[PDB]
């Protein structure tokens, strides 16, 4: 139940919701790592 | 007939009010001449007949309308009982230090604070 | 705790809590994005992401796949290094430093190498 | 004062004041909303041609 | 179309339904709070611009377009972006200041070269005078907002508590405040700066009124979208529940048929 | 275990587990060439377990008043309580304690899902003192599980909603319990009393662990006489309610 | 390409790519709404919905079911008509005009009728 | 020789597949990302291949080198097809010994690695 929408399970089991969670998130980490 | 409004709260929307203009600190009677001038950071007082309430404002614009209406707009406005002496001091000192603090308007902004916080202590 | 010592147990347990809490956030991130995450929430995300990477390790026998030479990390190293990260001592070190390395020392060394 | 020589605009001046007045309140009356009136995470970025120079604050 | 695929899909959408429902109720709270601040900013618009009613003011252009950085609010950003492009047909050489990455998004595709200044990080918290004033300041400082014949603020107006309409309101510079037909009816010190100060003060207040309105329009639109997303998710859950059960039944039968065939021989 | 039940004594039986027993029955019948049913279990696989569990019973006065209590164990596969054999046993027993890996990883241990766990017998066989404080521990928690999703929006919370979350988070952390450390009834009641009525709401969450240890040893040193009356009587006096409040409030000072 | 020519082949690939992109987004669309797509993706969905409709066709043996005269579109005209639609030349035309017609001339024709 | 020129290529299409999700996210940032964001799309077009048209290693190695080191980042997507068949005409016409080297030795010495680099940067300008 926890992570059932967001967390990446196998490729070939992907939501578009999994795909965007990793997209909005990877971007966020990039910005913060750039600033630090 | 007064509209006394801040961005976050509208206090009034009465007989006489006193307001600190850029020009002489002026009092406003029932049938005042249509006038539009600035408000420096000072003390706005309002007497509703006999009893009076006192609000220290941040400054804005005073507007006297043709139809005996007074519109006073300020960013901040608070009663005096709402201030703590020491917070004012802690700010005042930090502001004074910040005048000639370095290059920039950092220096100039402090100058503005000192004057305002001085005008505050002068009332109590 | 009776077997590995109360310190070890506590580190493991909170790594696992961090990774679990992470999952629950990844949901909110999927729908709502970043704007509904607290400052602690965003820190949890950041740390868990480093923890996940820190759990990776180049294997000696995987050398042909990795290119990277294999590392062997002593247990004490592992517990100490993970405790340090759980406390906060490396919140300023970027993810990539934790990925595909050995102990906490190899992290700082990689962190400085990517600065240059 | 002389915010004229400096870069200060009229409303920027009033805000500087308004800030000091908010900070001046009795600490317990510095409510959640009052403190929110005091902070912003806003940035500004200039644009030319559709690139841009350096991000700034405030 | 396996049982485990349907299960995963089902648990994923079940969370979505829960999250979106929650956001909607949150937004409802945020809207109560932002409703009162919208009224207050609308009283400092009846009293603030009542000078411009009597003085009866009339006018390269400066457009300031006001949305936010946040998605999940329906067509707030695209609808306002269309309203701006529509005004931009009537004058294509105007300068644009965008307040909000989402509007910057739209106008950067269609009219990329027109944008000269973008403001970031506005949408999260309720808009404040400090924010307005500091934006106005940088408008006056680096955009030379004083030297513009016409100035317009595009924002979304919450007509009702359900929907919104992209509205427009103009700002007149110090040069224009003086040339107003009934300007002189009030005792004014020409010695001191009253025109410049009134233009710079109204610039900040009007922007604060726009943002207060555009903010209450965005919460309302997000509460609308979150109500929809939650309702749609519910239907999805129902379709996948039904699919789950068909597949459940089939798997039991199919597994048993294998067993039967092995027993018969 | 029946020898005790029959001779006026009381026994507790743990079947660990009934899943693997079912598999063994299946192995027998298939190999005896008995006709297979669903998942290859025999026709009478419900009767494998119902026959067994019905032997647990509370006897009448006439028959000696003995009891046999059964704690069958079932291993579910993917959390699938709707799976075949689990579903048989769920419908046989009087209730179930359901455990979740999710809860386990979160720190909730024993990892019991309060929403999905029931005892259909319920209060009838609970210690009166526990029943008096637990009655509304059911309430505050059911209310907490409803509103739990709002914790993600702390900045947006109203008065009674923030209040529910604070109490809930605390009552949950209260139910955490190390292994091999069962507590006596008299040790349980005050801990639950302190939570339910509000005496925890002011304490930061991470401190509930050390609160439990310190609040207990304090009571055994100062108010042991209250613990004793709880243990011996099993009910709670209006006096004891008042003395307990008094004892609790006093400790809250630190 | 060796059989239908590079032009034909490439039109097909692009039609297929467009339809694929649209399928891939069905999740988001249904839950969140059209408003949550990028602008590049909104356009693709617009274009794909028109391609979906343009692939429909009135059959002569269906005239009773449809009440619509059968259409028989030449291969060459199908290629050209779809090429043109991919190139953007008909983005100003509403959806229903692509539905249940023959070649692109019929789209233009129906669009003008719908304008009336 | 192929292992050399395609050092990261596989995880480089995991670095590109990563940023493929960033585009429909709608955001227009990470200009450093833009560098890898563009490269991958060109690498993907480079890996496309008609049927019944296999390439010798000496034909592949240059192409991969060209793509990986970003010598393609400034070419139009729709012309990568024609770029390939011309680049290999150019290497057969002029640098015929370069190809023969890779063919016979199956490796690239530091000498060849720069000889190829120089021949690449050369062809970019038509």
Going by C-alpha positions, the residue among E192, E153, E200 that lies closest to residue E174 is: E200
Q: Which residues are within 8 A (CB) of G4 and not within 5 positions of it... i.e. 6 or more apart?
A: G12
Prior bond of G67 cis (ω within 30°): no
Contact state of A5 with E19 under an 8 Å Cβ cutoff? yes
User: Both E54 and E78 in a single domain?
Assistant: yes
Experimental determination technique: X-ray
Distance of alpha carbon D18 from alpha carbon D34, whole angstroms? 11
Query: Is E57 in contact with E184 (CB distance < 8 Å)?
Result: no
Partner residue opposite C23 with nearest CB, options A2, A29, A32: A2
Cα–Cα distances in angstroms (integers) from residue F162 to residues F159, F168, F201, in the given order: 5, 10, 11
Contact state of E134 with D41 under an 8 Å Cβ cutoff? no
Q: Point out the catalytic residue in the list F33, F109, F120, F170.
A: F120
User: Both E158 and E255 in a single domain?
Assistant: no
Contact state of E29 with F156 under an 8 Å Cβ cutoff? yes
| The two structure tokens encoding residue H109 | 């010495």
Q: Which pairing describes strands B77-78 and B51-57: parallel, antiparallel, or unpaired?
A: antiparallel
Cα–Cα distances in angstroms (integers) from residue E158 to residues B78, C33, E76, E147, G16, in the given order: 30, 25, 11, 31, 42
Q: Does B33 touch chain E (CB under 8 A)?
A: yes
Going by C-alpha positions, the residue among D36, D43, D56 that lies closest to residue E127 is: D36
B16 - beta bridge partners? B47
Distance of alpha carbon E100 from alpha carbon E108, whole angstroms? 12
User: Both E248 and E143 in a single domain?
Assistant: no
For residue D34, give the CATH number of its domain.
1.10.1620.20
Total residues belonging to chain D: 58
**Shortest distance, CA E5 to any CA of chain A (angstroms):** 8
Residues of E in contact with B7 (CB under 8 A): 40-41, 44, 128-129, 205, 208
Contact state of E128 with D40 under an 8 Å Cβ cutoff? yes
Residues of D in contact with E140 (CB under 8 A): 9
Distance of alpha carbon F71 from alpha carbon E120, whole angstroms? 61
Q: Does A24 touch chain H (CB under 8 A)?
A: yes
Per-position DSSP letters for chain H, written without gaps between them: -HHHHTSSHHHHHHHHHHHHHHHHTT----HHHHHHHHHHHHHHHHH---TT----HHHHHHHHHHHHTTTTTTS-GGGHHHHHHHHHHHHHHT-HHHHHHHHHH-S--HHHHHHHHHHHHHHH--
Q: Give chain E as a 3 state SS string.
A: CCHHHHHHHHHHHHHHHHHHHHHHHHHHHHHHHHHHHHHHHHHHHHCCCHHHHHCCCCCCEEEEEECCCCCCCCCHHHHHHHHHHHHHHHCCCCEEEEECHHHHHHHHHHCHHHEEEEEECCCCCCCCHHHHHHHHHHHHHHCCHHHCCEEEEEEEECCCCCCCEEEEEEECCHHHHHCCCCHHHCECCCCCCCHHHHHHHHHHHHHHHHHHHHHHHHHHHHHHHHHHHHHHHHHHHHHHHHHHHHHHHHHHHHHHHHHHHHHHC
The boundaries of the domain holding residue F181 are 127-254
Partner residue opposite B75 with nearest CB, options D18, D23, D27: D18
Please give the resolution of this entry in Å, rounded to 1 decimal: 2.5
Distance of alpha carbon B78 from alpha carbon B85, whole angstroms? 15
Distance of alpha carbon H42 from alpha carbon H40, whole angstroms? 5
User: Both E129 and E241 in a single domain?
Assistant: no
Phi, psi angles (nearest 5°) of residue F98: -110, 130
Contact state of G25 with A16 under an 8 Å Cβ cutoff? yes
Count Cβ atoms within 10 A of the Cβ of residue E227 and give its class: 0-12 exposed, 13-18 middle, 19 or more buried.
middle
Q: Does F180 touch chain C (CB under 8 A)?
A: no
| The two structure tokens encoding residue F23 | 């598999």
Query: Is F226 in contact with F246 (CB distance < 8 Å)?
Result: no
Distance of alpha carbon H64 from alpha carbon H61, whole angstroms? 5
| The two structure tokens encoding residue B101 | 């603090």
Query: Is E70 in contact with E123 (CB distance < 8 Å)?
Result: yes
Query: Is C50 in contact with C98 (CB distance < 8 Å)?
Result: yes
User: Both E145 and E130 in a single domain?
Assistant: yes
Chains A, H: CB contacts within 8 A come to: 21
Query: Is E100 in contact with E66 (CB distance < 8 Å)?
Result: yes
Q: Give chain F as a 3 state SS string.
A: CHHHHHCCCEEEEEECCHHHHHHHHHHHHHHCCCCECHHHCECCHHHHHHHHHCCCEECCHHHCCCEEEEEECCCCCCCCCCCHHHHHHHHHCCEECCECHHHHHHCCCCCECCCCCEECCHHHHCCHHHHHHHHHHHHHHHHHHHHHHHHHHHHHCCHHHHHHHHHHHHHHHHHCCCCCCCCCHHHHHHHHHHHHHCCCCCCCHHHHHHHHHHHHHHHHHHCHHHHHHHHHHCCCCHHHHHHHHHHHHHHHCC
Going by C-alpha positions, the residue among E74, E120, E75, E78 that lies closest to residue E97 is: E120
Going by C-alpha positions, the residue among B16, B6, B23 that lies closest to residue B70 is: B16
**Shortest distance, CA H15 to any CA of chain E (angstroms):** 25
Q: Which residues are within 8 A (CB) of F195 and not within 5 positions of it... i.e. 6 or more apart?
A: F137, F167, F170, F171, F174
Residues of C in contact with F152 (CB under 8 A): 28, 36, 41
Specify the number of domains making up chain E.
2
Specify the number of domains making up chain H.
1
Per-position DSSP letters for chain C, written without gaps between them: -TTT-HHHHHHHHHHHHHHHHHHHHHHHHHHT-STT--HHHHHHHHHHHHHHHHT----STTHHHH-SPP----HHHHHHHHHHHHHTTTTTS-GGGTTT--SHHHHHHHHHHHH-
Cα–Cα distances in angstroms (integers) from residue F199 to residues B62, F194, F246, in the given order: 54, 5, 11
Residue in chain G lying closest to H23 (CA): G38
Three-state DSSP at B64 gives strand
Distance of alpha carbon E101 from alpha carbon E120, whole angstroms? 6
For residue H13, give the CATH number of its domain.
1.20.150.20
Phi, psi angles (nearest 5°) of residue E70: -85, 140
Question: How far, rounded to the nearest angstrom, does the alpha carbon of residue B23 sit from its chain's CA centroid?
Answer: 14
Residue in chain F lying closest to C2 (CA): F179
Contact state of G31 with E109 under an 8 Å Cβ cutoff? no
B51 - beta bridge partners? B48
| The two structure tokens encoding residue F123 | 């209060």
Cα–Cα distances in angstroms (integers) from residue H7 to residues B25, C59, C61, H65, in the given order: 79, 20, 20, 9
Residues of E in contact with B38 (CB under 8 A): 192, 194, 197
F and C touch per CB criterion (3+ pairs under 8 A): yes
Query: Is G34 in contact with E232 (CB distance < 8 Å)?
Result: no
Active site residue F120: yes
Q: Does E22 touch chain B (CB under 8 A)?
A: no
Distance of alpha carbon F130 from alpha carbon F236, whole angstroms? 9
Residue in chain H lying closest to E109 (CA): H28
The boundaries of the domain holding residue D3 are 1-58
Query: Is E158 in contact with E213 (CB distance < 8 Å)?
Result: yes
CATH of domain G1-116: 1.10.1140.10
Q: Does G10 touch chain H (CB under 8 A)?
A: no
Cα–Cα distances in angstroms (integers) from residue H22 to residues E67, E82, G30, H27, H33, in the given order: 22, 25, 21, 7, 10
Q: What are E16-21's contacts with CB under 8 Å, separation 24+?
A: E16/A5, E16/A17, E16/C31, E16/E229, E16/E233, E16/G31, E17/E230, E17/E233, E17/E234, E17/E237, E18/F149, E19/A5, E19/C27, E19/C28, E19/C31, E19/C32, E19/F149, E20/C31, E20/E226, E20/E229, E20/E230, E20/E233, E21/E226, E21/E230
Q: Which residues are within 8 A (CB) of E154 and not within 5 positions of it... i.e. 6 or more apart?
A: E63, E64, E65, E66, E80, E83, E84, E87, E166, E167, E168
- The one-character DSSP state at A5 is T
Question: How far, rounded to the nearest angstrom, does the alpha carbon of residue G92 sit from its chain's CA centroid?
Answer: 13
H106 - beta bridge partners? none
The boundaries of the domain holding residue E148 are 26-225
Only one residue has tokens 């919701």, namely A17
Residue in chain C lying closest to F150 (CA): C36
């Amino acid at each position: 139940s926890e992570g059932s929408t967001g967390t990446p399970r196998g490729s070939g089991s992907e939501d578009s919701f999994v795909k965007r969670a990793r997209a909005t998130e990877d971007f966020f980490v990039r910005q913060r790592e750039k600033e630090q | 007939k007064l509209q006394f409004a801040l961005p976050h709260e509208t206090l009034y929307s009465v007989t006489q009010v006193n307001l600190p203009a850029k020009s002489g600190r002026i009092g406003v009677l029932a049938n005042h001449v249509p006038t539009v001038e600035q408000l420096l950071p000072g003390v706005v007082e309002v007497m509703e007949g006999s009893n009076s309430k006192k609000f220290f404002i941040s400054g804005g614009f005073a507007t006297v309308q043709p139809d005996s209406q007074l519109c006073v707009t300020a960013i901040e406005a608070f009663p005096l009982e709402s201030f703590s002496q020491e917070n004012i001091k802690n700010l005042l000192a930090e502001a004074k230090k910040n005048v000639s603090s370095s290059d920039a308007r950092e220096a100039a902004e402090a100058a503005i604070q000192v004057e305002v916080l001085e005008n505050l202590q002068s009332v109590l | 705790a009776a077997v590995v010592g109360q310190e070890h147990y506590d580190v493991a347990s909170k790594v696992q809590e961090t990774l679990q809490t992470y999952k629950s956030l990844q949901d909110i991130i999927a729908i709502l994005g970043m704007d509904e995450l607290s400052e602690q929430d965003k820190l949890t995300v950041e740390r868990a992401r480093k923890i996940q990477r820190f759990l990776s390790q180049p294997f000696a026998v995987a050398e042909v796949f990795t290119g990277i030479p294999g590392k062997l990390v002593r247990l004490k190293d592992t517990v100490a290094s993970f405790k340090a990260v759980l406390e906060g001592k490396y919140d300023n070190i970027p993810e990539h430093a934790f990925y595909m390395v050995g102990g906490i020392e190899d992290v700082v060394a990689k962190a400085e190498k990517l600065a240059a | 004062s002389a915010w004229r020589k400096a870069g200060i605009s009229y409303a920027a001046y009033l805000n500087v004041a308004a800030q000091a007045i908010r900070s001046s309140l009795k600490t317990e009356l510095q409510t959640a909303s009052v403190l929110n009136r005091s902070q912003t995470d806003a940035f500004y970025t200039q644009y030319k041609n559709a690139s841009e120079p350096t991000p700034i604050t405030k | 179309a396996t049982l485990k695929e349907v299960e995963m899909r089902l648990k994923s959408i079940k969370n979505i339904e829960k999250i979106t429902k929650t956001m909607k109720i949150v937004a409802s709270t945020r809207l109560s709070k932002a409703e009162k601040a919208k009224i207050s900013a609308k009283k400092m618009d009846e009293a603030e611009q009542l000078f411009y009613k009597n003085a009866e003011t009339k006018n390269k252009e400066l457009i300031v377009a006001i949305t936010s950085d946040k998605g999940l609010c329906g067509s707030i950003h695209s609808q306002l972006a269309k309203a701006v492009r529509r005004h931009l047909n009537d004058q294509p050489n105007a300068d644009i200041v965008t307040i909000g990455d989402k509007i910057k998004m739209q106008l950067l595709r269609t009219h990329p070269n027109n944008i000269k200044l973008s403001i970031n990080g506005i949408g999260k918290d309720a808009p404040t005078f400090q924010e307005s004033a500091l934006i106005a300041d940088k408008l006056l400082s680096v955009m030379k907002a004083g030297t513009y014949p016409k100035i317009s603020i595009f924002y979304n107006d919450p007509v009702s508590s359900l929907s919104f309409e992209p509205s427009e309101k103009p700002i007149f510079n110090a040069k224009t405040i003086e040339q107003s037909p009934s300007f002189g009816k009030f005792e004014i010190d020409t010695d001191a700066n009253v025109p410049r100060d009134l233009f710079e003060y109204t610039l900040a207040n009007q922007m604060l009124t726009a943002m207060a309105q555009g903010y209450a329009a965005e919460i309302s639109a997000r509460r609308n979208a979150m109500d929809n997303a939650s309702k749609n998710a519910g239907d999805m859950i129902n379709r996948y529940s039904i699919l789950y059960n068909r597949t459940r039944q089939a798997v039991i039968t199919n597994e048993l048929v294998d067993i039967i065939t092995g027993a018969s021989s | 275990g029946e020898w005790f039940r029959d001779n006026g004594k009381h026994a507790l039986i743990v079947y660990d587990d009934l899943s693997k027993q079912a598999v063994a029955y299946r192995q027998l019948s298939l190999l005896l060439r008995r006709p297979p049913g669903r998942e290859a279990y025999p026709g009478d696989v419900f009767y494998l377990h119902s026959r067994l569990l019905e032997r647990a019973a509370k006897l009448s006065e006439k028959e000696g008043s003995g009891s046999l209590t059964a704690l069958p164990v079932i291993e579910t596969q993917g959390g699938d309580v709707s799976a075949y054999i689990p579903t048989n046993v769920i419908s046989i027993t009087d209730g179930q304690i359901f455990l979740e890996a999710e809860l386990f990883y979160k720190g909730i241990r024993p990892a019991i899902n309060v929403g999905l766990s029931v005892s259909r017998v319920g209060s009838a066989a609970q210690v009166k003192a526990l029943k008096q404080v637990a009655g509304s521990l059911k309430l505050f928690l059911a209310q907490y599980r409803e509103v739990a999703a709002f914790a993600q929006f702390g900045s947006d919370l109203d008065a009674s909603t923030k209040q529910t979350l604070v109490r809930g988070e605390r009552l949950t952390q209260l139910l955490k319990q190390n292994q091999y450390s069962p507590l006596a009834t008299e040790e349980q009641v005050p801990l639950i009393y302190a939570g339910v009525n509000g005496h925890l709401d002011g304490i930061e969450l991470s401190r509930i662990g050390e609160f439990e240890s310190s609040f207990l040893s304090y009571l055994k040193s100062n108010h042991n006489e209250l613990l004793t009356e709880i243990r011996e009587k099993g009910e709670l006096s209006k006096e004891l309610l008042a003395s307990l409040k008094s004892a609790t409030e006093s400790f809250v000072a630190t």
